[PDB]
């Protein structure tokens with residue numbers, strides 16, 4: 001799957017909030033463009049002159065993630081974070097010259113991402129009480145991956161000492177996206193576990209943190225909550241469910257060609273970190289059938 005690469009696969013079935021450190025530093029920001037940031041300003045002015053109702057927004061930028069030696073005690077992951085914006089994103093990752101910027105970045109900084117906004121997305125493998133994952137159908141009238149299948153998530157907005165506040169706002173925000181879009185009560189939701197981080201190669205390699213959340217409602221109750229919002233309560237145009245049994249082989253189904261890249265990352269990481277049993281019990285041929 002060339003539109004998704006894994007940057008991080010978390011250990012021990014996935015990492016709780018309490019085992020993650022963030023470092024938020026201007027050292028982690030995008031580098032100024034070779035000819036200067038005037039190019040970003042130009043693209044932005046042109047866009048507002050077509051769509052004057054648009055507004056800019058801060059985003060978290062992923063610089064890198066470092067995993068501790070496996071089976072160690074103490075914090076298991078360090079996320080190195082800076083700040084970007086919607087505007088810097090439109091002017092870099094979504095620019096026509098994004099492939100050229102990545103190459104100038106290798107030359108100048110030995111980093112394909114150095115000239116890119118790279119805002120950090122979040123997504124969820126969201127399981128029901130009756131062992132299904134939740135999927136959403138994207139509007140055919142939005143710009144990014146129109147009419148494709150997606151999982152709940154978003155692009156959180158800002159505001160280990162501030163670092164802990166940052167990690168808390170990342171975990172908080174995956175639950176908040178589930179409450180806003182799927183219309184579920186917060187109290188039906190487990191604390192998220194981080195499964196890993198995936199990169200979208202169709203969007204110049206911008207990264208999404210992928211989480212696992214369990215809901216106490218059955219699929220039938222989740223559908224009722226979703227639909228009871230009405231067309232204005234969600235940006236998606238439908239909801240649907242696949243048995244966890246059937247997620248194992250989803251990359252061999254015709255559904256795979258319809259999944260947007262960040263949802264592909266969420267399913268691959270769910271399969272590697274939450275699926276894939278290590279024990280004799282869940283390893284046994286009758287519980288884990290071959291091929």
Ligand SMILES: COC(=O)c1cccc(NS(C)(=O)=O)c1
Nearest residue numbers: 056057058059083084085086088
């Ligand atoms: C490039 O953007 C930043 O680093 C940054 C820092 C601080 C605040 C914001 N907010 S906004 C609404 O201007 O996009 C962006």
